[PDB]
Design a protein around this ligand. Sequence first.
Ligand SMILES: CCCCCCCCCCCCCCCCCC(=O)OC[C@H](COP(=O)([O-])OC[C@H](O)COP(=O)([O-])OC[C@H](COC(=O)CCCCCCCCCCCCCCCCC)OC(=O)CCCCCCCCCCCCCCCCC)OC(=O)CCCCCCCCCCCCCCCCC
Ligand SMILES: CCCCCCCCCCCCCCCCCC(=O)OC[C@H](COP(=O)([O-])OCC[N+](C)(C)C)OC(=O)CCCCCCCCCCCCCCCCC
Ligand SMILES: CCCCCCCCCCCCCCCCCC(=O)OC[C@H](COP(=O)(O)OCCN)OC(=O)CCCCCCCCCCCCCCCCC
Ligand SMILES: CCCCCCCCCCCCCCCCCC(=O)OC[C@H](COP(=O)(O)OCCN)OC(=O)CCCCCCCCCCCCCCCCC
Ligand SMILES: CCCCCCCCCCCCCCCCCC(=O)OC[C@H](COP(=O)(O)OCCN)OC(=O)CCCCCCCCCCCCCCCCC
Ligand SMILES: C=C(C)[C@H]1Cc2c(ccc3c2O[C@@H]2COc4cc(OC)c(OC)cc4[C@@H]2C3=O)O1
Ligand SMILES: C=C(C)[C@H]1Cc2c(ccc3c2O[C@H]2COc4cc(OC)c(OC)cc4[C@@H]2C3=O)O1
Lengths: 105, 98, 314, 80, 167, 96, 171, 347
Amino acid sequence: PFFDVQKKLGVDLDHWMTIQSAEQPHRIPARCHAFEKEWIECAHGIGSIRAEKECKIEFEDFRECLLRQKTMKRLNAIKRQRDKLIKEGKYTPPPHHSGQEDLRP
Amino acid sequence: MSLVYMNIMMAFTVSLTGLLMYRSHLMSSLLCLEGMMLSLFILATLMILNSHFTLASMMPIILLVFAACEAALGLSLLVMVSNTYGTDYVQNLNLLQC
Amino acid sequence: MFMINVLTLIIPILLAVAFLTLVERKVLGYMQFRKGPNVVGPYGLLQPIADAIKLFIKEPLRPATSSISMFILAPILALTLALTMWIPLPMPYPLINMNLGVLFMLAMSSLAVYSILWSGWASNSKYALIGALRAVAQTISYEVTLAIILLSVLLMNGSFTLSTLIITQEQVWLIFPAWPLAMMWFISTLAETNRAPFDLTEGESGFNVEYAAGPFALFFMAEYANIIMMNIFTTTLFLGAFHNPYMPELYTINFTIKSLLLSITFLWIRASYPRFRYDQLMHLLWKNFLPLTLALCMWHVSLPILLSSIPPQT
Amino acid sequence: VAAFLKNVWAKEPVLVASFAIAGLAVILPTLSPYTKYSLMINRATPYNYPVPLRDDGNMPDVPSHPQDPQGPSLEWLKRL
Amino acid sequence: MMTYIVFILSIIFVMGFVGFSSKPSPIYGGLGLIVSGGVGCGIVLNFGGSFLGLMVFLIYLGGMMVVFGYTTAMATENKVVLGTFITGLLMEFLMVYYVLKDKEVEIVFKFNGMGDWVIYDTGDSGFFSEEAMGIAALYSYGTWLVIVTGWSLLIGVVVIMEITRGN
Amino acid sequence: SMMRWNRERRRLQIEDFEARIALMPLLQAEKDRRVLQMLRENLEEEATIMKDVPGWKVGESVFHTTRWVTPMMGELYGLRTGEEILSSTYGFIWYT
Amino acid sequence: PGIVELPSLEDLKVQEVKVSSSVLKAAAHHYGAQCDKPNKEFMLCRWEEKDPRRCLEEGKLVNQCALEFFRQIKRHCAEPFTEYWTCIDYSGLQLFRRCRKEQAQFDKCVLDKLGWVRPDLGELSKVTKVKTDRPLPENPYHSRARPEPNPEVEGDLKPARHGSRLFFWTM
Amino acid sequence: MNPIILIIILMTVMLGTIIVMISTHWLLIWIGFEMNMLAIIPIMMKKHNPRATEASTKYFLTQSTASMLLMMAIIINLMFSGQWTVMKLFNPMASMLMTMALAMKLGMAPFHFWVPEVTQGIPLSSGLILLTWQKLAPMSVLYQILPSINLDLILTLSILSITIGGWGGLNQTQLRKIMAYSSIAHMGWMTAVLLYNPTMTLLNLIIYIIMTSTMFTLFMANSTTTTLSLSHTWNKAPIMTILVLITLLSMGGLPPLSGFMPKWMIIQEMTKNDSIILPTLMAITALLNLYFYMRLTYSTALTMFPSTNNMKMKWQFPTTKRMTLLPTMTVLSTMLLPLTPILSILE
Ligand SMILES: CCCCCCCCCCCCCCCCCC(=O)OC[C@H](COP(=O)([O-])OC[C@H](O)COP(=O)([O-])OC[C@H](COC(=O)CCCCCCCCCCCCCCCCC)OC(=O)CCCCCCCCCCCCCCCCC)OC(=O)CCCCCCCCCCCCCCCCC
Ligand SMILES: CCCCCCCCCCCCCCCCCC(=O)OC[C@H](COP(=O)([O-])OCC[N+](C)(C)C)OC(=O)CCCCCCCCCCCCCCCCC
Ligand SMILES: CCCCCCCCCCCCCCCCCC(=O)OC[C@H](COP(=O)(O)OCCN)OC(=O)CCCCCCCCCCCCCCCCC
Ligand SMILES: CCCCCCCCCCCCCCCCCC(=O)OC[C@H](COP(=O)(O)OCCN)OC(=O)CCCCCCCCCCCCCCCCC
Ligand SMILES: CCCCCCCCCCCCCCCCCC(=O)OC[C@H](COP(=O)(O)OCCN)OC(=O)CCCCCCCCCCCCCCCCC
Ligand SMILES: C=C(C)[C@H]1Cc2c(ccc3c2O[C@@H]2COc4cc(OC)c(OC)cc4[C@@H]2C3=O)O1
Ligand SMILES: C=C(C)[C@H]1Cc2c(ccc3c2O[C@H]2COc4cc(OC)c(OC)cc4[C@@H]2C3=O)O1
C-alpha cells in the first residue's frame, strides 16, 4: 500500500528531494536538469507501461547524461587511435594541444 | 560508467561477505556492518557530488546519523551478550536452536 | 618554497613546546615561592635541551605488548595530529588556507583520542587500560561542549573559515558577546588536554606510564603541542587581534602575546587548585556545562535573527 | 511562584540560567522588531545573477537600467 | 599517475576492507576500518565534498569508531584470516590488471578504464559550495527530515537506556 | 557592536556580489568563446585523426536531441597535456 | 544521431579584455552602470536561447563595449584608476573596504571628467527589462511532441452488472 | 518497562511503519525501516533474559544487513535514474537487491533462518508484533515496485518459502516456532501472487494478520508456549481449545473457513495467468502444513488429557487477562468466507 497522506492533506513532506529538476537552493541546476525535465514531462500521466516504450529516447538521453558511457566510449576511441598514430608516427600534436599557445581569455 | 564506483561497490561486497559467513566475534560482524555503511556513504557522496544534485547533499549525513545510531544500538546488544557469556563469540548465541 | 613554510611552521612548534617546559617549571616555581631551573643554562635556558637529550638516551622498555604495532602507532599518531592542528591557524595567514578550518581542527582533535586508547591497549597492565578508558571518556565528554560552543561562536562568524574570524573581531573581541561560551570553552580545552584540575594521569597511574623516555618525550611534547595550539585557537576565537594587511607582524606579535598569556593562564590554573574526582568532572560536563551550552546555543541561534545581525556567508 | 523560584535559584542556579536563556531564545524573536530585517537582508543578498526580462511592452514596475528609480531599493539597509 | 589519484585511493579503500573483513581480531579490524575511513574520506574530499569529508573524520572516525575501539577495549579484553586477505588482494589486483590493460571491464556493470577526471563539470558555482548550501537546506527545505531524524535520535537515547538497564 | 559590524559586513558582501554581477556578462561571453574554441579545436584534430577508422562520423553527437549540451570536462580537455588536465580538474580542490 | 554544429575559429575572434581580475573588479560598478544595455541583451539572449552558439554576436557587443569602457578610462583617468586597482590588487580577498580613498579619487575623477555616477547599494542586482528585436524561441529545449494522455473517466456511474460475478456470489 | 515509555516506543514502531507507507522518497523509506527496527528492539527485550538478548541480536543483524542492502539498492537506483521516487526501479540489479532486502525483512527463504529463533526468544506479545505489524512495511514497498520485480526471483523466493515453512513446522512442538514457520509459508503465499494480482496479496496479508493475532491472543490468554501446555487447556477453559482448533484449521486452509479464502483466490488469480503447475504444487505444499495442523489438533487438542492436581486450584480463579479483540478476531478468522467478495475494498 501507498497511503498517499501527502496529497490527501496537501502537505509537501518529501517531494522536494525526489528529483533533480525540483527547486534547489540558490537556483542551482543539476548537470542533467534539462534531460530529466524532458523525460519527466514526456512520461507524465501516461503511466509507466506507456512510459517505458514511448519515452525511450528522452530516458536514453538522460541516462547517457548521467553516466556518459557513449561520450567516454567516443573519447576512448579517439584517444586510442591518437595513441596508435603517435606510436606509428603518422600524427603530431598541434601547439594548442601540447600547451604552447597562451590560452584565449 | 565511472571506475571508482566499481571499487566502492567491490568494497561493499567484500564487507558484505565478511559479515555473512564467518561465525566469529560479534564485534567483527558490527565492524563489517559499519564498513558497509562507510562504502554506502562514499558511494552516495560521489554520486550526489557528481550529478550536482544540491538537495541530496544532506542525504549522506542522514545516511551517517541513523546508521551510527544503529551502530550504537548494536553495541548495546553486544554488551548484553558481553554481560551474559563474558565473550562476544556468536556460537554462544545458540540457545534458541531448541 | 612551500616546504620552507612547512618547516618554519613545524620546527618552531617543537622548539616552543621545548621551552614551554622551562616556562612551566619557572612560573610554577615562582608561584610556589621558589625558583625553577637556573643552573643548567643561564636562567635555565639549557634545561629543556639537557632534558630531551637525557630522555633520548635512556633505555626504553620494549615490554610484552598486546600490540607492538599500536605501541609504535601511538606516538606517531600523537605527533602527526599534534603537528597538523597548526596548519589552518591564521596568524594572520595560515599555511593551509581552507574554507572549513574550524571543522577541520574539530575533526582532527577528535582523532586524538586514539593515541590514548592505543597507549592503553599496548600496555598489558589492565589498570593502565582502565585509566586510558577514563581518559578517553573524559576527552570525548568535553569534545561535545567544544563542538557546541564552537558552533555557537561560528554562528557569529558566518562561516567555518578561520581567517574570517579575524574579520569578525575587527571592532570588538568576541569574548564580549560570548564570555559564557568563552569561559566554558576555556575550561573545556583545559579538560581536553588532560590538564589540571582535570588531569587523572598522575594519581588515582595514567595511560602513558608504560612509556619511558624514548616515546614518552614525544608523547609529552605532542601533548604540549596541543596545549599551545588550543590557546592559540582560543586566541583566534575570542581575543582576535588587530590585523593590518600591510604589516602582518602586528597581528603576529599581538596574537603571540595573547597566546603566551593564555598558556601562562593554564600554568597559573594548575598551580592554584586541587584535582577533580573523576565523576566530579563528569558532573561538571554533563550537568553544568552541557545545559548552559545548549541554552546559549539556542541563544546564539536566535540572537542574530532577532537583532538583524546575521553575519555574511562569504 | 517566588518561593520555588528562589529555592531553585539557591539550589540549581546553573539550571535556572539555562532555562531562562532558553526561554528568552524561544520567545524573544517573536517580540523583536528587528526579526523582519533579518529576512529582508537575507533576501536582498544577490547570490545569483538578476536575469533580465524581455520587455513585452507593459512592465512599468521593472526598470530599464540599474540606476532607474523604479525597482527594489536598499535604502532601508543603508539607513537602518 | 597523479591524474588517477582518486582511483589510486579507491584501490587502497578496497584493500583496506580486505584488510579488516579477513578479521584477525576486532582490534585490528577496527584499525583497518579507520584507515579505510581515512582513504575513502580522501576520495570524498577529492570531488569537492569537503563538509562530507569532515563528517567522515569528525563523526565516523572521530565519533563512532572511537566508541567501537572503546567497547573493543573494555568488553573484548593465522590461516583463515591471511588466506582470505591474500585471496581478496589477488582478486583486486587481477581486476586492476584487467581494467588497466583493457580500459573497459564487466563484472556486474560495464565500467570505463580511464580516470574519472573526465566526468566532471566545467562550470563554477559563484560564492558558495553547492554541497554546503545543500546541507544548509536541511533547516529550510528539510523540515520533515529533521523531525524524523530528531525523533529517531531521541528514541535511540531512550532505547539504549532501556536495553542497557537489564531490569 | 556585533550588530553594527555584521550589518556593515552584509552591506559589504552585497557590494562584492554586485561587482561580481556586473562582471558576469563579460565572463560569460569569454567562457562561451572559450568552450566553443576548445570544441572547434577538438573537432579539427578529430577530423585529422579519425580518418583511418571506418564508419566514423567526425563530430557525431551521442545525444538524440539537438539541444546544446554543456561540454563535459573530458570533452574539452581530452586531447591536451596532463598539466592542463590536472589544473582544470583539481586546481580549485587542491588550492591551498 | 547527428553532427553537432560548431562555429569556425574566425567566428570566435574578438579583441579580448586582457586585464586582470582586480582591474575588472576595480571598475566593476562603473562597468555595470555604463555597459548596461549590451550586457543585458547578451544575458537575456543567453538565458533565452540556452545555447552559446546563438549568443556569439551579442557577446561580441559585450567585448565591443567593455573595451570602449576601458579606453574611455585610459584616455581620461588612467592614474587614479591605476592607483585604485593596485590597492585592490594587493588584497588576497580583494577587499573594496581596504581601498576607500583610492576609490574616492577614482570616483571623483570619473564624475568630473566623464559624469558617471557610481551605482548605489542595491542597484546592479535589479531585475531590469531588455528591449531587443530578436524573436522569442518557440522551443528552446528542442523538445519533440509529448505523448498523448490517457482517456479520462466520463459517464455516470452505474451499478455492477449482477454484482461481483465471483463464482456464485450473486451480489 | 515504564508504561509511558512503552506507549512512546510502540508509537515509534507504528510511526516507522507509517513513514514507510506514506513517503515518496527512498531515503524516507530507509529511515522508516531504521526507525521501526530501533524502536522494536526494546519490545523484544521486555523480560530481560538471555534468550531475548540472543533473539534481539539476531533480529538486529538480519534487519541491519537488510537495511544496508536496501540502501545499496536505492543508491544503484540513483546511479541509473538520477532520482529518488518510490516507484519502479531503473536497474535489474537494484531490483534484485531490493527484492533480496525485503525478503530478509519479511523472513522469506533462504533468509528464513532467524524467524523460528527470534520468535522463540521473545514474549508472545512481541512475537505478535513481529509476525503481524512488521510485515506491513516491506509488503508496502513490494506493492509499489512490482513493475520492476523479476518474476523468476520472486517466484523462487515464494516457493522456497512455502516449502521451507511447510517442512519446517512438521517437527515442532513449540507454538512460537509453529507460528514462525507458518509466517514464512504465508509470506511465500503473499509474494507468489504479487505480480499477478496485488489485491489478493493484500487479502492474504489481512487474513493472515487476523488469524495470527487470534492465535497469539489465545496463547497470551492461556499462557501456553508449548504443545503440551496447550493440551492442558481443556480442563481450565474448554472454549480456548475450541478456538485454537478452529483457528489452526483456518490457518492451514480448510474450507469453509476464512483462511481458505485468500489462497483459493490466489489459485484463482494464478490460473487466469495460465500458471497451473505452480499453484498446484504450492497448494500441495500447503497440504503438508494443514496436515501437521491436523496432527497438532487431532492428537493433541481434541481427545482429553491427563491433568495435574494443581489445576484444581486454578479452577477457582477466572481469567483477568485483557483478551483484547479476541472474540471479534476469532469470529473474523473463521466465519468470513461467505463475505469473500469483500476483497474489492482492498483494490
Ligand atoms: C421494504 C424494505 C424492507 C424489506 C424487508 C424484507 C426482509 C424482512 C426480513 C428480514 C430478515 C432478512 C434476512 C436476510 C435476507 C435473506 C437471506 C437469505 O435467505 O439468503 C439466501 C441465501 C441464498 O439463497 P437465494 O435463493 O439465492 O436468495 C434468496 C433471497 O433473495 C436472499 O437474497 P439474495 O438473493 O440477494 O442473496 C444474496 C447472496 C446470496 O448468496 C449467494 O449468492 C451465495 C453465497 C452465500 C455464501 C456461501 C458461503 C459458503 C461457505 C461458508 C459456509 C458457512 C457455514 C454454514 C453456516 C453455519 C452456521 C453459521 O448473499 C450472500 O452472498 C451473502 C452470504 C449469505 C448471507 C445470508 C444471510 C445470513 C443472515 C443470517 C445469518 C445466520 C447464518 C446463515 C447461514 C450462513 C452461511 C451463508 O442462502 C444461503 O446462502 C444459504 C444460507 C441460509 C440463508 C440465511 C437465512 C437468513 C435467516 C436465518 C434464520 C435462522 C437462523 C438460525 C440460527 C443461526 C444459524 C445457526
Ligand atoms: C577564554 C578566556 C578565559 C575565560 C575565563 C576563565 C579564566 C578563569 C579560570 C579560573 C579557574 C577555573 C578552574 C576550573 C574550575 C572548574 C570548576 C567550575 O568553575 O565549575 C563551574 C561551575 C559548576 O558549578 P559548581 O561546581 O560551582 O557547583 C556544583 C554544582 N551544583 C550547584 C549543581 C551542585 O559553574 C558553572 O558551570 C558556570 C559556567 C559558566 C556560567 C556562565 C553564566 C552566564 C550568565 C548568564 C546570565 C545569568 C543571570 C541570570 C539570568 C539573566 C537573564 C538576562
Ligand atoms: C594508521 C594509519 C596512519 C595514521 C597516522 C596518519 C593519519 C592521521 C593524521 C593525518 C590526517 C589526515 C587528514 C587529511 C584530510 C583532512 C580534511 C581536509 O582535507 O580538509 C581540508 C580541506 C577542506 O577545505 P576546503 O577549503 O573546502 O578545500 C579547498 C577547496 N577550496 O580539504 C582540502 O584542502 C582538500 C585537499 C585535497 C584532498 C586531501 C586528501 C588528504 C589525504 C586523505 C587522507 C589521508 C590520511 C588517511 C588516514 C586518516 C586517519 C586514519
Ligand atoms: C521553556 C523554555 C525552554 C526549555 C527547554 C530548554 C532547556 C535548556 C536547558 C537544558 C537542560 C537539560 C537537562 C534538564 C533536566 C531538568 C530536570 C532536573 O534536573 O531535575 C532534577 C533537579 C534536582 O537535581 P538532582 O536530581 O538532585 O540532580 C543532581 C543535582 N543535585 O531538579 C531541578 O533542577 C529542578 C528543575 C526545574 C526548575 C527550573 C526552573 C528554572 C526557571 C528559570 C526562569 C524561567 C525560565 C522560563 C522557562 C520555564 C522553565 C521551568
Ligand atoms: C493495509 C495495511 C494498513 C494497516 C492495517 C492495520 C494493521 C493492524 C496490525 C495489528 C498488529 C497488532 C500488534 C499487537 C498490538 C500492538 C500493541 C501490543 O503489543 O499490545 C499487546 C499488549 C501488550 O501488553 P503487555 O503488558 O506488554 O503484555 C504482556 C502480558 N503480560 O496487550 C496484551 O498483550 C493483551 C493481550 C491481547 C492483545 C491483542 C492484540 C490484538 C491486536 C490485533 C487486532 C487485529 C488486527 C486488526 C484488524 C485487521 C487489520 C489488518
Ligand atoms: C620536551 C622536552 C624538551 C623534554 C622536557 C620534558 C620532557 C618530557 C617530560 C617532561 C618534561 O619537562 C617537565 C619536567 O618536569 C616536570 C615536572 C612535573 O611535576 C613536578 C610535571 O608535572 C606534570 C611535568 C614535568 C615535565 C615533563 O613531564 O621532554
Ligand atoms: C490423524 C490425522 C492428522 C487426521 C487423519 C484422520 C483423522 C481423523 C479421522 C480420520 C482420519 O483419517 C481419515 C482417512 O480417510 C478418511 C476419508 C474420509 O472421507 C473421504 C473420511 O470421512 C469421514 C474419514 C477418513 C479417515 C478418518 O476417519 O485425523
